[PDB]
Amino acid sequence: STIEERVKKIIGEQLGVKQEEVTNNASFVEDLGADSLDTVELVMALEEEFDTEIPDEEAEKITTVQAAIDYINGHQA
Amino acid sequence: EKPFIARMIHAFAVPIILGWLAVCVVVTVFVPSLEAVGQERSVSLSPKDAPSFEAMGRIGMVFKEGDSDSFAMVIIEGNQPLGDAAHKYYDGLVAQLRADKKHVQSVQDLWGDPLTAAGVQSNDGKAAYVQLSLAGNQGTPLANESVEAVRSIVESTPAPPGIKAYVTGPSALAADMHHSGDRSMARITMVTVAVIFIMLLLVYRSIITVVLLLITVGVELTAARGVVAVLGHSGAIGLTTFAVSLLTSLAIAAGTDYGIFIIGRYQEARQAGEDKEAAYYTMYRGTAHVILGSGLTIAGATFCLSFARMPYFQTLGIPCAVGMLVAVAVALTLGPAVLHVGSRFGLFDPKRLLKVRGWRRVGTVVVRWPLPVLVATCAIALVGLLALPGYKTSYNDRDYLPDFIPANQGYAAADRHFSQARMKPEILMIESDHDMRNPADFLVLDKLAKGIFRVPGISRVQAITRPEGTTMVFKNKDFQRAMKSFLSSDGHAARFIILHRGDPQSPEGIKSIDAIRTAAEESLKGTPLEDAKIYLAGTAAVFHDISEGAQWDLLIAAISSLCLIFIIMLIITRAFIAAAVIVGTVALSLGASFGLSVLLWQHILAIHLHWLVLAMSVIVLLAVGSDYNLLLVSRFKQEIGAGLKTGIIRSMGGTGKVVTNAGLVFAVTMASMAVSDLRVIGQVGTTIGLGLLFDTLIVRSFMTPSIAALLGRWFWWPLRVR
Ligand SMILES: CCCCCCCC/C=C\CCCCCCCC(=O)OC[C@H](COP(=O)(O)OCCN)OC(=O)CCCCCCC/C=C/CCCCCCCC
């Protein structure tokens, strides 16, 4: 499937948000209701799904759906 | 996918239910009850090759006073010093006991002889005792008959004013221990079911789901007990009240866990929106092999007790192994069969949202930082060994039985007037090729009697040289009775009756045996009887062998279970490191269970653990503990594919609440076993209960997932995973 669709799938499954509900601009902790640990779950789930490493310092920069999409697009090459 | 076996159970769910119900009726009606088969199929309590056992046989054979290692003591008690009236009652009582050749092989009547009457009369003067040699070894059905035959004779005899008679001895205690164990089977089961019913009612909040779940356990319990009863009734196996008590609780505990696993996964599937038919197969694919693997483990683990030397352990293997195989076969066929038919009416659907955020968040921490979690749990698991230095086992069967059983009533009658050692004498016999009745050898008897009396921890020694047990002619009539009592009619062997100070059951008493044997050899060295052979018998000698035997056969039971459980887990999972981790983690946690149990019993309650406790409880802890790891690990193998780490988190949520409920049910089921009259079996019950609480709360939840997160793909070697 599309990389963006897969990322949205993972995010929605973890945070209990539907595929159409999660938006590119939405922020995990501010809008989707994430917290300090659901973001860790998100990071690990993306790492496993797309066989990529999000460094701890880089982990902080994923605050919205988009940020994850840009990161993975720039590293899924 | 629809596995073949699942389809067959699905297609024949109805007759499978009737097939097991009909089997339950057959074993209930046409087979005697297990608690009644055990009584007619009980096993002797000492291995045939123990030096104490064969020595006791030789002493009986050489002196022609029986062939069994079973003896019972009749204590006569009175409110005033025993006068002539007691003697008439005693004299008639002994004659009646002698007439019963079937049960009373010999009556060592000493109180009737003035030359030795003071040797058995209490210093108080208000009590006396006589030692009976009973037919059949301790604990065998014949011994229980002989004890009852002696006991009835005492009861039927009319006693003078104020006099009372009690029957005691190791054989009487073993007979009463068996009766107490069987007498308490109903109470254990009623409490177990009542507690489990209330617990499951909270977990599911639906009475029908609990009622059907417990009914299925009843069929597993009735079929497991029924099949084991058939074997025992046919003479194929030996049984003991420990096997019956332990088998009954394992079937209820393990049988209920399979029901919780089956319903737990079925309900989880329904939450995912799966149809009743698809949910049933999802349950089978997820738990059919886990139940079988967790079943062969308990059957295999308990079967490893058959390698032990002690009959208490050796006879405990097969009945528990066959019991668990029968219970599992029912759970794998009646379980899914009942689940399907119940589903036709919509009975097993979940009543509450099956939340998983709780365990996913726990799993996230464990998997993100696994090494710190592994270190913390290992330390908590290992800190239980701090109780090892102070751990003191016990061998006094008296203290682990009700105060009111007839054997204990008679023992208490002895303590009121005698020292605690008089009911547990020690006999040492020297056998040679010469007629020792010559005066020259009698000097050696005097020398050895004093030498043995010199050993610390002894109070009294009786022999020809010491008729009264303390220091003070072949033709005197009175001496003749002593001669034939302390010397073999052939004159080739002589025996000394030795009494310790303090209970010989204590480790101090056990230490006396080695000292006594060394002293006997030292006394005879450089004497005409230097080549004689030394035989030792009695409770101190019996438990000198048991103490040594009980150690090695704890090692054999533990090591064999690890080897067998690892093989089963290696076959079930197909992964080497996963198999080692499943059982290796539980092996470490044994320290926590040992520490918790010792702390509760020895220290808090001030009751030492019986020598049976560790060997029996260790077998179950390794078995059941690994099953919870197997359920968790078997879920890893399914969820993997979404990630080696994310698979652990997903599996933790799915199996989290399921195992915790199943863990507590097993722990409480084994904990409810403390309601038994046999405190020995209660110590086993809470020893397993405490351990399974630790395993379900720390081993499965924080230790196993952390190891899986640490090792990565190597956790599944040689399976190809990414
Ligand atoms: C009493 C009368 C009973 C009448 C009924 C007969 C019994 C019917 C009950 C159950 C059998 C059918 C259901 C059981 C599950 C079938 C097998 C299964 O599901 O998986 C097999 C599964 C396949 O692996 P996976 O692919 O991971 O599985 C996924 C699919 N589930 O393999 C296993 O489970 C391996 C089984 C063997 C394990 C190793 C055994 C080694 C030896 C053990 C000794 C055990 C103790 C012996 C004690 C002897 C005492 C005298």
JSON list of N, CA and C and ligand atoms in Angstrom, two decimals, chain B residues 5 20 284-285 288-289 292-293 296 299-300 303 318 321-322 325-326 329 332-333 564 567-568 571-572 574 637, ligand 1:
[
{"chain": "B", "resi": 5, "resn": "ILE", "atom": "N", "xyz": [-8.30, -30.99, 12.93]},
{"chain": "B", "resi": 5, "resn": "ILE", "atom": "CA", "xyz": [-8.84, -31.43, 14.22]},
{"chain": "B", "resi": 5, "resn": "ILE", "atom": "C", "xyz": [-9.94, -30.48, 14.68]},
{"chain": "B", "resi": 20, "resn": "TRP", "atom": "N", "xyz": [-18.07, -37.68, 26.64]},
{"chain": "B", "resi": 20, "resn": "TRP", "atom": "CA", "xyz": [-17.34, -37.48, 27.89]},
{"chain": "B", "resi": 20, "resn": "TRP", "atom": "C", "xyz": [-18.26, -37.61, 29.09]},
{"chain": "B", "resi": 284, "resn": "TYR", "atom": "N", "xyz": [-8.74, -21.83, 18.39]},
{"chain": "B", "resi": 284, "resn": "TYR", "atom": "CA", "xyz": [-8.03, -23.10, 18.26]},
{"chain": "B", "resi": 284, "resn": "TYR", "atom": "C", "xyz": [-6.62, -22.89, 17.74]},
{"chain": "B", "resi": 285, "resn": "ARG", "atom": "N", "xyz": [-6.46, -22.07, 16.71]},
{"chain": "B", "resi": 285, "resn": "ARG", "atom": "CA", "xyz": [-5.12, -21.82, 16.18]},
{"chain": "B", "resi": 285, "resn": "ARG", "atom": "C", "xyz": [-4.22, -21.18, 17.22]},
{"chain": "B", "resi": 288, "resn": "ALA", "atom": "N", "xyz": [-4.74, -24.14, 20.86]},
{"chain": "B", "resi": 288, "resn": "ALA", "atom": "CA", "xyz": [-4.79, -25.60, 20.80]},
{"chain": "B", "resi": 288, "resn": "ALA", "atom": "C", "xyz": [-3.43, -26.20, 21.12]},
{"chain": "B", "resi": 289, "resn": "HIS", "atom": "N", "xyz": [-2.36, -25.66, 20.53]},
{"chain": "B", "resi": 289, "resn": "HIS", "atom": "CA", "xyz": [-1.03, -26.17, 20.81]},
{"chain": "B", "resi": 289, "resn": "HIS", "atom": "C", "xyz": [-0.52, -25.73, 22.17]},
{"chain": "B", "resi": 292, "resn": "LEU", "atom": "N", "xyz": [-1.99, -28.15, 24.70]},
{"chain": "B", "resi": 292, "resn": "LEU", "atom": "CA", "xyz": [-1.30, -29.43, 24.60]},
{"chain": "B", "resi": 292, "resn": "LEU", "atom": "C", "xyz": [0.11, -29.34, 25.14]},
{"chain": "B", "resi": 293, "resn": "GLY", "atom": "N", "xyz": [0.84, -28.29, 24.76]},
{"chain": "B", "resi": 293, "resn": "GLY", "atom": "CA", "xyz": [2.20, -28.13, 25.25]},
{"chain": "B", "resi": 293, "resn": "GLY", "atom": "C", "xyz": [2.25, -27.90, 26.75]},
{"chain": "B", "resi": 296, "resn": "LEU", "atom": "N", "xyz": [1.42, -31.52, 28.26]},
{"chain": "B", "resi": 296, "resn": "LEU", "atom": "CA", "xyz": [2.51, -32.48, 28.26]},
{"chain": "B", "resi": 296, "resn": "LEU", "atom": "C", "xyz": [3.60, -32.07, 29.23]},
{"chain": "B", "resi": 299, "resn": "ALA", "atom": "N", "xyz": [2.30, -33.17, 32.76]},
{"chain": "B", "resi": 299, "resn": "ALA", "atom": "CA", "xyz": [2.36, -34.62, 32.75]},
{"chain": "B", "resi": 299, "resn": "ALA", "atom": "C", "xyz": [3.80, -35.10, 32.75]},
{"chain": "B", "resi": 300, "resn": "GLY", "atom": "N", "xyz": [4.64, -34.50, 31.91]},
{"chain": "B", "resi": 300, "resn": "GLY", "atom": "CA", "xyz": [6.04, -34.89, 31.87]},
{"chain": "B", "resi": 300, "resn": "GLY", "atom": "C", "xyz": [6.79, -34.51, 33.13]},
{"chain": "B", "resi": 303, "resn": "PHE", "atom": "N", "xyz": [5.80, -36.73, 35.95]},
{"chain": "B", "resi": 303, "resn": "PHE", "atom": "CA", "xyz": [6.31, -38.07, 35.68]},
{"chain": "B", "resi": 303, "resn": "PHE", "atom": "C", "xyz": [7.76, -38.21, 36.09]},
{"chain": "B", "resi": 318, "resn": "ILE", "atom": "N", "xyz": [3.52, -41.53, 38.22]},
{"chain": "B", "resi": 318, "resn": "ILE", "atom": "CA", "xyz": [2.56, -42.05, 37.25]},
{"chain": "B", "resi": 318, "resn": "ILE", "atom": "C", "xyz": [1.15, -41.56, 37.52]},
{"chain": "B", "resi": 321, "resn": "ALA", "atom": "N", "xyz": [0.90, -38.17, 36.29]},
{"chain": "B", "resi": 321, "resn": "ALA", "atom": "CA", "xyz": [1.13, -38.11, 34.86]},
{"chain": "B", "resi": 321, "resn": "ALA", "atom": "C", "xyz": [-0.11, -38.56, 34.09]},
{"chain": "B", "resi": 322, "resn": "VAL", "atom": "N", "xyz": [-0.68, -39.70, 34.47]},
{"chain": "B", "resi": 322, "resn": "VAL", "atom": "CA", "xyz": [-1.88, -40.19, 33.81]},
{"chain": "B", "resi": 322, "resn": "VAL", "atom": "C", "xyz": [-3.05, -39.25, 34.08]},
{"chain": "B", "resi": 325, "resn": "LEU", "atom": "N", "xyz": [-2.66, -36.22, 31.72]},
{"chain": "B", "resi": 325, "resn": "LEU", "atom": "CA", "xyz": [-2.91, -36.57, 30.33]},
{"chain": "B", "resi": 325, "resn": "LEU", "atom": "C", "xyz": [-4.40, -36.73, 30.06]},
{"chain": "B", "resi": 326, "resn": "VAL", "atom": "N", "xyz": [-5.13, -37.33, 31.01]},
{"chain": "B", "resi": 326, "resn": "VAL", "atom": "CA", "xyz": [-6.57, -37.49, 30.84]},
{"chain": "B", "resi": 326, "resn": "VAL", "atom": "C", "xyz": [-7.27, -36.14, 30.94]},
{"chain": "B", "resi": 329, "resn": "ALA", "atom": "N", "xyz": [-6.60, -34.21, 27.66]},
{"chain": "B", "resi": 329, "resn": "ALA", "atom": "CA", "xyz": [-7.34, -34.73, 26.51]},
{"chain": "B", "resi": 329, "resn": "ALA", "atom": "C", "xyz": [-8.79, -34.28, 26.55]},
{"chain": "B", "resi": 332, "resn": "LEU", "atom": "N", "xyz": [-8.92, -30.45, 25.64]},
{"chain": "B", "resi": 332, "resn": "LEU", "atom": "CA", "xyz": [-8.70, -30.18, 24.23]},
{"chain": "B", "resi": 332, "resn": "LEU", "atom": "C", "xyz": [-9.89, -30.59, 23.37]},
{"chain": "B", "resi": 333, "resn": "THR", "atom": "N", "xyz": [-10.77, -31.45, 23.87]},
{"chain": "B", "resi": 333, "resn": "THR", "atom": "CA", "xyz": [-11.92, -31.92, 23.11]},
{"chain": "B", "resi": 333, "resn": "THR", "atom": "C", "xyz": [-13.24, -31.44, 23.70]},
{"chain": "B", "resi": 564, "resn": "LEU", "atom": "N", "xyz": [13.42, -32.40, 30.56]},
{"chain": "B", "resi": 564, "resn": "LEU", "atom": "CA", "xyz": [12.21, -32.82, 29.85]},
{"chain": "B", "resi": 564, "resn": "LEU", "atom": "C", "xyz": [11.39, -31.61, 29.40]},
{"chain": "B", "resi": 567, "resn": "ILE", "atom": "N", "xyz": [12.88, -30.01, 26.41]},
{"chain": "B", "resi": 567, "resn": "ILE", "atom": "CA", "xyz": [12.65, -30.78, 25.19]},
{"chain": "B", "resi": 567, "resn": "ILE", "atom": "C", "xyz": [11.25, -30.53, 24.66]},
{"chain": "B", "resi": 568, "resn": "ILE", "atom": "N", "xyz": [10.25, -30.50, 25.55]},
{"chain": "B", "resi": 568, "resn": "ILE", "atom": "CA", "xyz": [8.88, -30.25, 25.12]},
{"chain": "B", "resi": 568, "resn": "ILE", "atom": "C", "xyz": [8.77, -28.84, 24.54]},
{"chain": "B", "resi": 571, "resn": "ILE", "atom": "N", "xyz": [10.32, -28.65, 21.16]},
{"chain": "B", "resi": 571, "resn": "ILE", "atom": "CA", "xyz": [9.47, -29.22, 20.13]},
{"chain": "B", "resi": 571, "resn": "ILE", "atom": "C", "xyz": [8.28, -28.31, 19.84]},
{"chain": "B", "resi": 572, "resn": "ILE", "atom": "N", "xyz": [7.68, -27.75, 20.88]},
{"chain": "B", "resi": 572, "resn": "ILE", "atom": "CA", "xyz": [6.48, -26.93, 20.69]},
{"chain": "B", "resi": 572, "resn": "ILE", "atom": "C", "xyz": [6.82, -25.66, 19.92]},
{"chain": "B", "resi": 574, "resn": "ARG", "atom": "N", "xyz": [9.95, -24.86, 18.42]},
{"chain": "B", "resi": 574, "resn": "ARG", "atom": "CA", "xyz": [10.92, -25.09, 17.36]},
{"chain": "B", "resi": 574, "resn": "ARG", "atom": "C", "xyz": [12.12, -24.16, 17.47]},
{"chain": "B", "resi": 637, "resn": "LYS", "atom": "N", "xyz": [5.32, -15.68, 18.62]},
{"chain": "B", "resi": 637, "resn": "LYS", "atom": "CA", "xyz": [5.51, -16.29, 17.32]},
{"chain": "B", "resi": 637, "resn": "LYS", "atom": "C", "xyz": [4.38, -15.94, 16.36]},
{"chain": "C", "resi": 1, "resn": "LIG", "atom": "C1", "xyz": [-8.34, -40.13, 27.66]},
{"chain": "C", "resi": 1, "resn": "LIG", "atom": "C2", "xyz": [-9.03, -40.37, 26.33]},
{"chain": "C", "resi": 1, "resn": "LIG", "atom": "C3", "xyz": [-8.85, -39.21, 25.36]},
{"chain": "C", "resi": 1, "resn": "LIG", "atom": "C4", "xyz": [-9.61, -39.38, 24.05]},
{"chain": "C", "resi": 1, "resn": "LIG", "atom": "C5", "xyz": [-9.31, -38.29, 23.03]},
{"chain": "C", "resi": 1, "resn": "LIG", "atom": "C6", "xyz": [-7.90, -38.36, 22.45]},
{"chain": "C", "resi": 1, "resn": "LIG", "atom": "C7", "xyz": [-7.12, -37.06, 22.59]},
{"chain": "C", "resi": 1, "resn": "LIG", "atom": "C8", "xyz": [-7.64, -35.91, 21.73]},
{"chain": "C", "resi": 1, "resn": "LIG", "atom": "C9", "xyz": [-7.14, -34.59, 22.21]},
{"chain": "C", "resi": 1, "resn": "LIG", "atom": "C10", "xyz": [-6.26, -33.79, 21.63]},
{"chain": "C", "resi": 1, "resn": "LIG", "atom": "C11", "xyz": [-5.54, -34.03, 20.34]},
{"chain": "C", "resi": 1, "resn": "LIG", "atom": "C12", "xyz": [-5.91, -33.01, 19.26]},
{"chain": "C", "resi": 1, "resn": "LIG", "atom": "C13", "xyz": [-5.81, -31.55, 19.70]},
{"chain": "C", "resi": 1, "resn": "LIG", "atom": "C14", "xyz": [-4.43, -31.12, 20.16]},
{"chain": "C", "resi": 1, "resn": "LIG", "atom": "C15", "xyz": [-3.73, -30.14, 19.24]},
{"chain": "C", "resi": 1, "resn": "LIG", "atom": "C16", "xyz": [-3.23, -30.75, 17.94]},
{"chain": "C", "resi": 1, "resn": "LIG", "atom": "C17", "xyz": [-1.81, -30.30, 17.62]},
{"chain": "C", "resi": 1, "resn": "LIG", "atom": "C18", "xyz": [-1.69, -28.81, 17.49]},
{"chain": "C", "resi": 1, "resn": "LIG", "atom": "O1", "xyz": [-2.64, -28.07, 17.55]},
{"chain": "C", "resi": 1, "resn": "LIG", "atom": "O2", "xyz": [-0.43, -28.38, 17.30]},
{"chain": "C", "resi": 1, "resn": "LIG", "atom": "C19", "xyz": [0.65, -29.33, 17.22]},
{"chain": "C", "resi": 1, "resn": "LIG", "atom": "C20", "xyz": [1.95, -28.57, 17.30]},
{"chain": "C", "resi": 1, "resn": "LIG", "atom": "C21", "xyz": [2.40, -28.05, 15.96]},
{"chain": "C", "resi": 1, "resn": "LIG", "atom": "O3", "xyz": [3.16, -26.84, 16.16]},
{"chain": "C", "resi": 1, "resn": "LIG", "atom": "P1", "xyz": [2.56, -25.42, 15.74]},
{"chain": "C", "resi": 1, "resn": "LIG", "atom": "O4", "xyz": [2.65, -25.32, 14.27]},
{"chain": "C", "resi": 1, "resn": "LIG", "atom": "O5", "xyz": [3.17, -24.36, 16.58]},
{"chain": "C", "resi": 1, "resn": "LIG", "atom": "O6", "xyz": [1.02, -25.58, 16.12]},
{"chain": "C", "resi": 1, "resn": "LIG", "atom": "C22", "xyz": [0.03, -24.68, 15.54]},
{"chain": "C", "resi": 1, "resn": "LIG", "atom": "C23", "xyz": [-1.28, -25.39, 15.35]},
{"chain": "C", "resi": 1, "resn": "LIG", "atom": "N1", "xyz": [-2.02, -25.51, 16.63]},
{"chain": "C", "resi": 1, "resn": "LIG", "atom": "O7", "xyz": [2.98, -29.48, 17.81]},
{"chain": "C", "resi": 1, "resn": "LIG", "atom": "C24", "xyz": [2.93, -29.78, 19.12]},
{"chain": "C", "resi": 1, "resn": "LIG", "atom": "O8", "xyz": [2.13, -29.33, 19.88]},
{"chain": "C", "resi": 1, "resn": "LIG", "atom": "C25", "xyz": [4.01, -30.75, 19.49]},
{"chain": "C", "resi": 1, "resn": "LIG", "atom": "C26", "xyz": [3.48, -31.94, 20.29]},
{"chain": "C", "resi": 1, "resn": "LIG", "atom": "C27", "xyz": [4.58, -32.81, 20.87]},
{"chain": "C", "resi": 1, "resn": "LIG", "atom": "C28", "xyz": [5.38, -32.13, 21.97]},
{"chain": "C", "resi": 1, "resn": "LIG", "atom": "C29", "xyz": [6.60, -32.92, 22.42]},
{"chain": "C", "resi": 1, "resn": "LIG", "atom": "C30", "xyz": [6.27, -34.20, 23.16]},
{"chain": "C", "resi": 1, "resn": "LIG", "atom": "C31", "xyz": [7.50, -34.92, 23.69]},
{"chain": "C", "resi": 1, "resn": "LIG", "atom": "C32", "xyz": [7.16, -35.87, 24.80]},
{"chain": "C", "resi": 1, "resn": "LIG", "atom": "C33", "xyz": [6.51, -35.57, 25.90]},
{"chain": "C", "resi": 1, "resn": "LIG", "atom": "C34", "xyz": [6.17, -36.49, 27.03]},
{"chain": "C", "resi": 1, "resn": "LIG", "atom": "C35", "xyz": [4.97, -35.98, 27.82]},
{"chain": "C", "resi": 1, "resn": "LIG", "atom": "C36", "xyz": [4.79, -36.66, 29.16]},
{"chain": "C", "resi": 1, "resn": "LIG", "atom": "C37", "xyz": [4.58, -38.16, 29.08]},
{"chain": "C", "resi": 1, "resn": "LIG", "atom": "C38", "xyz": [4.17, -38.78, 30.41]},
{"chain": "C", "resi": 1, "resn": "LIG", "atom": "C39", "xyz": [4.00, -40.29, 30.35]},
{"chain": "C", "resi": 1, "resn": "LIG", "atom": "C40", "xyz": [3.41, -40.88, 31.62]},
{"chain": "C", "resi": 1, "resn": "LIG", "atom": "C41", "xyz": [3.31, -42.39, 31.57]}
]
